[PDB]
């Protein structure tokens, strides 16, 4: 979707091993705020609606 009618699904209650992104090597602007890319794996919250 777009930025004017974006959806916000529920991101929790499901396996999210974000290392599945860290072998991407094809991104351009992977940025993380309030957390480093590494330390969102050991600890990462609920209500993480994407």
């Amino acid at each position, epitope marked *: 979707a777009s930025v004017y009618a974006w959806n916000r699904k529920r991101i929790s209650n499901c396996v999210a091993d974000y290392s599945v992104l860290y*072998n991407s*090597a094809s*991104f351009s*602007t992977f*940025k993380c*705020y309030g957390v*480093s*890319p*590494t330390k969102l794996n050991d600890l990462c919250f609920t209500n993480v609606y994407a």
Partner: nanobody
Framework: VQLVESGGGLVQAGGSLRLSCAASGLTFSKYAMGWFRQAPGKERKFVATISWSGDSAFYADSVKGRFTISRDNARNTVYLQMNSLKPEDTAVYYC??????????????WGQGTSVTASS
């Protein structure tokens, strides 16, 4: 505002190579630093990036074991060591900085780009 590339890949034989950029326009411990490259024909691709203060470092899938993105919080300088020079590393390199954790097609400050190339 100042982030300039220097050095080169002017090598007559294989060996260890170094790049010596400088960050002298704004802070260097806040702006997470990065290092990209554009091959002569291939596009700008990720090489290395660092955390805000240099606390986290990671590389690509083919440069991790032979590169060294060294930053310098003090004396305003930054280097990128290229080791075990390979023909797949011909490019023009750029030192960079951003408010995230590096790794952005558009940075806060962009380097000029020095030509590094390995020929054997």
């Amino acid at each position: 505002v100042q982030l300039v590339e220097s050095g080169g890949g002017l090598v007559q034989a294989g060996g260890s190579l170094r790049l010596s950029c400088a960050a002298s326009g704004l802070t260097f411990s806040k702006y997470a630093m990065g290092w990209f490259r554009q091959a002569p024909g291939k596009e700008r691709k990720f090489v290395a990036t660092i955390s805000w203060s240099g606390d986290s470092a990671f590389y690509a899938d083919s440069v991790k074991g032979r590169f060294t993105i060294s930053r310098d919080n003090a004396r305003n300088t930054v280097y990128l060591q290229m080791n075990s020079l390979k023909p797949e590393d011909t490019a023009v390199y750029y030192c960079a900085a951003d408010r995230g954790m590096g790794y952005g097609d558009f940075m806060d400050y962009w380097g000029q780009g020095t030509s590094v190339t390995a020929s054997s």
